[PDB]
């Protein structure tokens, strides 16, 4: 683990090269520490940032999705776009390469099957669908009482990382069905759920933990509530009803103050 | 099992993806940021 | 000294009032190595004919102008033999030397944020779920004048967001300093230089469909004339591709 | 693990021995790589086919059979003939030698007995049948809640492999009861099921995983939906009802296109 | 054996009925060396994207057809990124691999002279002193169907000479063997290959104004069907630039 | 248990059939196919 540096002693200084002057324009952050500004003592400083590294920061297994079994059947397309709090944390970065371990928290009872359906094929659309009988589609059978199912999905990119943001399109110029952003760039599969009993509740919570993460290009954190998934659209249409039609709210987190200089 | 006043790093499922968090950390420097200059 | 000269073959920038050059992520553009390669065909390196400064149209910077953005490689698609190589190849990569130029006078005040955003995915100008159109995110060399936030901005045709405070993507300006950037403060410098390598999780991709970078110039503090009758100043952008590669020669993807 | 070969560099070539010419008639595949055709660069290629080897390809534990407990009793004759998706994957090969691990997924509750009945003897035909009391017939007692039963059956051939296809008969020329195909060639036993309680549902799913596989003579993959088991008959009789009597459908997976050269 | 394969990057010729390749003047195309250079700027080598086979339109060879010619670099001016590099540069050089293709049947008879003429300066179609027009000596990939000698050939507009016996320049066909050439005799071979280096007394010149080479296909003996109903056979020409260079990047000389 | 910067291949049930998948792979060649020729 890496501890933060110690504070070194510093005395009075008369210097013709100010360290406290600079240029904000150059594009560089300040190198100034308290030894440049005040007169300091030696402090032996054992603090660590270990809990701020991208493995610990993104490694807590957030809830990605919720589904309800309707007629003892549910379906979920794997993605982080649906939940704002985990979507904001992934979007501090442009590119992420991670394995994910998927824990399924269900309040149902009896017996459940999860099918991981790899991209490019058809999933079971109901319980009792013949497609639940699969040679090569990986599935998980579990009894929700006595344990939570968990499996790891490795990194399935088509690229060396996942795009969190994608400034391109999947089709050429004149195509009218063009799709913008990361949705065409990869698909992580879908999870199909069914119950082989009736028993308990219908709620299925999918918790996902990124592990073995490599993050690439830091971005400004999301300053606005999300509106749609796979968008970046931050303009929110609160109501379709009437004269407030076509009125949009940004919904940011900036708060005002009565006066500068009085705070 | 997979690999190794002691310690033992043992992989039960024999896959590199099936392991827990990667706690072995070397690579770092803020200077890619905060000082991204030629000279 | 503040003097600088950058010679990319056939063309030379000379900047006499200048900061250090920003080398994005401390990384110079390189050619794609064999360790990282995907496609099996031998790529083409145009070198001096593609790699050279292409100056775009200037934009008039005024009181009340909210900003501008350009997409790359897009802005260069019609420029010289670099733009020709985009249409005749499947894939391509490149780094860029972006040189932004604004000079006024010691009586003028103002500040510009010049930033390069990797994968700058815009937001729709407002309302329902609509992908911003290919037509709007590919203006070419002309870039996009940012207009501004309004309830009256036309929401037709999948138009991009006009609000520079949210970076058009929904994240605060003022955090844009996490990207390679410089400020042009008329008090201090009249120009900026950013050398960006090729940034992508892919070795090469289609130059036309995907815009790797985005150059964004935001007037952080407005333009004050002082005592002069000059209420507007041009802003010229000059881009040099550097270490550009192309592979997958085909028919031109043009019309 | 075996990675695929690297792409080597190649330049312009003027050669009086074309590598791109050949004869389709000789019965051999092309040796051509992109270094013979185009001008190439060195690519360092780490990709593996590990997931395509016959152990991984056939090693996923497909569902072989489903049975329903009728009066708390079920019976299943072990075979892969019933399920089309796993039957197609085994039939890429003429001969297979594998051990199989058998997992039983049941939605019943309480207490179940599985009896493995080796060939050549009589099985229990009901629950409470005295034959459920056995000295030497291997059985499994399990409670479906808290765990799924699993056991391995080794390779029981009579031969060195299983026949997936058999072009012979079990009886001589003039015998009228002749049976064609692999059904006489081996019998893997049958699984008898009973419940010692009432409790849960009646459904019993038998999942089988081939392991330690050796495959022999590759065959063309099945191009047509199956009709009967132990047949290879692909002609499907959809209805016995009326004038459509004796009309057969092949039911293949070939799809047409409007034009060649326009695709 | 008679088999041959020529791979110039991205493209492959395969000739199964073939002669030796003519290497013009025993000289392979090279890049311009530093000893022979004139201009000071670093040239561009497009390599695999420009250097590759460009097949032109086929010409129908018939009873009574007098021949065809193509001008080089001209024929390639619209072809791929090679033709793009012609318009964006002052100067350029290149060698060429010309592969001519005519196949008929063992019942057909005929012979073709396939020759490459350096500096093939045409003659005006007749009469007074008139330079042949730029428009006529630059047909592009289409080349020129030689028509034939007549008093009725239109003398308007500075048209070139139509008579193949005099090589359109006033020198006898049949001495055309002093240039790099092969004969396609339908009895013998269905194709031809000529590798010409860059020939000029100048290191590089303008690709558009000057035509270095000329490819001339003359039906030395007419096409006899034998007993078949096939009275015409196509003739396809495929050109690979090789070791092509360009220098003096500028605006495209196009319109 | 049955048999053996480390690794341990351990058989819990002491049968060769009771083991998991066989991951140790050597034998291969496409040439039985794609080139099944005398000369």
D15 touches chain E (CB under 8 A): yes
Q: Do chains C and F touch (3 or more CB pairs under 8 A)?
A: no
Q: What is the CA radius of gyration of chain E?
A: 18
Q: Cβ contacts of residue D195 below 8 Å, gap of 6+?
A: D69, D72, D73, D108, D110, D111, D112, D127
D239 touches chain E (CB under 8 A): no
A199 touches chain D (CB under 8 A): no
The sign one gets for the Cα dihedral F32, F34, F38, F39 is: negative
**CB pair distance less than 8 Å for D86 and A135:** yes
D34 touches chain C (CB under 8 A): yes
The nearest alpha carbon in chain F to B3 belongs to F6
Query: Which chain F positions have a beta carbon within 8 Å of B2's beta carbon?
Result: 6-7
User: Chains that contact E by 3+ CB pairs under 8 Å?
Assistant: C, D
Of D63, D88, D107, the CB nearest to A111: D107
Neighbour tally for A127: CB within 10 Å: 18
Query: Which chain E positions have a beta carbon within 8 Å of C90's beta carbon?
Result: none
Of D60, D83, D107, the CB nearest to A196: D107
E45 touches chain C (CB under 8 A): yes
Mutation for testing the D interface, residue in A135, A136, A142, A155 having most D CBs under 10 Å? A135
Query: Which chain F positions have a beta carbon within 8 Å of B4's beta carbon?
Result: 5-6
Experimental method: cryo-EM
What is the DSSP secondary structure assignment for residue A53, as one 8-state letter? S
Please spell the DSSP secondary structure of A68-132, one letter per residue. Answer: E-SSSEEEEE--STT-HHHHHHHTTBSEEEEEEEEEEEE---S-EEEEEE-TTSPPP-STT-GGG
3-state secondary structure E85-104: HHHCEEEEEEEEEEEEECCC
D40 touches chain C (CB under 8 A): yes
Number of domains in chain E: 1
Angle ∠(A233,C112,C68) on CA atoms, nearest 5: 45
Alpha helices in C27-166 (DSSP H): 80-87, 134-137
F25 touches chain D (CB under 8 A): yes
Of D62, D146, D203, the CB nearest to A134: D62
Contact predicate C60/C213, CB 8 Å: no
Domain assignment of residue E197, given as a range: 1-255
Residue E127, classed as helix, strand or coil, is: coil
Angle ∠(D136,D142,D144) on CA atoms, nearest 5: 150
Report d(CA F1, CA F11) in Å as an integer. 5
Helix (H) or strand (E) segment spanning residue E84: helix E80-87
**CB pair distance less than 8 Å for D38 and E11:** yes
Q: Cβ contacts of residue D172 below 8 Å, gap of 6+?
A: none
Could you tell me the two tokens for A240? Answer: 């379709």
Contact predicate C226/C103, CB 8 Å: no
On the 0-12 / 13-18 / 19+ scale of CB atoms within 10 A, A143 is buried
Please spell the DSSP secondary structure of C155-221, one letter per residue. Answer: -GGGPBP--TTTTTTTS-TTSGGGSSEEEEETTT-SEEEEEE----SSS-B-TTT---EEEEEEEEE
**CB pair distance less than 8 Å for C20 and B32:** no
Contact predicate C219/C59, CB 8 Å: no
E177 touches chain D (CB under 8 A): no
| Residues pairing with C91 in the sheet | C247
Query: Which chain E positions have a beta carbon within 8 Å of C42's beta carbon?
Result: 9, 47-48
E49 touches chain D (CB under 8 A): no
The domain spanning residue C181 has which CATH number?
Answer: 2.60.120.20
What is the DSSP secondary structure assignment for residue D66, as one 8-state letter? E
Report d(CA D114, CA F30) in Å as an integer. 43
Contact predicate E49/C246, CB 8 Å: yes
Q: Do chains B and F touch (3 or more CB pairs under 8 A)?
A: yes
Report d(CA A22, CA A112) in Å as an integer. 63
A212 touches chain C (CB under 8 A): no
**Cα atoms in the Cβ-side hemisphere of radius 13 Å centred on A15:** 10
Residue C142, classed as helix, strand or coil, is: helix
Contact predicate E5/E191, CB 8 Å: no
The nearest alpha carbon in chain B to A218 belongs to B33
| Residues pairing with C155 in the sheet | none
Residue E233, classed as helix, strand or coil, is: strand
Q: Do chains E and A touch (3 or more CB pairs under 8 A)?
A: no
Domains defined along chain D, listed by start: 1-263 (2.60.120.20)
Q: Please give the resolution of this entry in Å, rounded to 1 decimal.
A: 2.8
Of D153, D211, D218, the CB nearest to F21: D211
Residue A256, classed as helix, strand or coil, is: coil
Report d(CA E218, CA C22) in Å as an integer. 63
How far D6 CA lies from chain A's nearest CA (Å)? 18
């Amino acid at each position: 683990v890496l501890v933060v540096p110690d504070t070194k002693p510093s005395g009075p200084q008369h210097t013709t090269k100010p360290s406290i002057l600079g240029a904000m324009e150059i594009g560089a952050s300040s190198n100034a520490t308290p030894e440049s500004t005040i007169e300091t003592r030696y402090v032996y400083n054992t603090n660590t940032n270990a809990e701020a590294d991208v493995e610990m920061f993104l490694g807590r297994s957030a809830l990605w999705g919720k589904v309800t079994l309707t007629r003892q059947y549910a379906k979920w397309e794997i993605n982080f776009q649906e939940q704002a709090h985990i979507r904001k944390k992934f979007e501090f970065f442009t590119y992420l390469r991670f394995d994910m371990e998927v824990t399924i928290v269900t309040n149902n009872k009896g017996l459940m099957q999860i099918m991981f359906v790899p991209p490019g094929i058809d999933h079971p659309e109901t319980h009792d669908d013949r497609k639940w009988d699969s040679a090569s589609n990986p599935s998980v059978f579990f009894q929700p009482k006595s344990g939570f199912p968990r499996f790891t999905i490795p990194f399935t990119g088509l690229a060396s990382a996942y795009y969190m943001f994608y400034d391109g399109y999947d089709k050429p110029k004149g195509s009218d069905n063009n799709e913008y952003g990361i949705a065409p760039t990869n698909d992580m599969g879908l999870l199909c759920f069914r119950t082989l009993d009736n028993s308990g509740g219908n709620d299925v919570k999918i918790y996902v933990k990124p592990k073995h993460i490599t993050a690439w290009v830091p971005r400004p954190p999301r300053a606005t509530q999300y509106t749609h998934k796979y968008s970046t659209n931050y303009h929110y249409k609160p109501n379709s009803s009437g004269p407030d039609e076509h009125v949009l709210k940004d919904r940011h987190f900036i708060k005002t103050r009565p006066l500068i200089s009085s705070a | 099992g997979a690999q190794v006043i002691k310690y033992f790093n043992i992989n039960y499922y024999k896959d590199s993806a099936s392991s827990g968090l990667s706690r072995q950390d070397f690579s770092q420097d803020p200077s890619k940021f905060t000082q991204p200059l030629v000279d | 000294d503040r003097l600088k000269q950058i010679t990319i073959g056939n063309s030379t920038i000379t900047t006499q009032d200048s900061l250090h050059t920003v080398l994005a992520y401390g990384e110079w553009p390189t050619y794609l190595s064999d360790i990282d390669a995907t496609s099996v065909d031998k790529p083409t390196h145009p070198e001096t004919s593609a790699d050279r400064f292409y100056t775009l149209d200037s934009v008039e910077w005024q009181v009340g102008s909210h900003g501008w953005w350009w997409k790359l490689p897009d802005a260069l698609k019609d420029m010289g033999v670099f733009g020709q190589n985009m249409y005749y190849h499947s894939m391509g990569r490149s780094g860029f030397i972006i040189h932004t130029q604004c000079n006024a006078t010691k009586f003028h005040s103002g500040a510009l944020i010049v930033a390069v955003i990797p994968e700058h995915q815009l937001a729709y100008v407002g309302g329902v779920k609509v992908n911003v159109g290919y037509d709007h995110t590919h203006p070419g060399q002309s870039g996009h004048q940012i207009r501004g936030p309004s309830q009256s901005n036309d929401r037709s045709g999948g138009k991009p967001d006009e609000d520079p405070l949210f970076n058009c993507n929904g994240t605060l300006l003022g955090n844009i300093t996490i990207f390679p950037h410089q400020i042009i403060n008329l008090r201090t410098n009249n120009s900026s230089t950013i050398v960006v390598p090729y940034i992508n999780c892919v070795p090469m991709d289609n130059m036309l469909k995907h815009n790797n970078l985005s150059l964004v110039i935001i007037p952080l503090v407005p333009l004050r004339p002082g005592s002069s009758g000059i209420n507007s100043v041009p802003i010229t952008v000059t881009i040099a591709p550097y270490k550009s590669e192309f592979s997958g020669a085909m028919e031109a993807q043009r019309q």
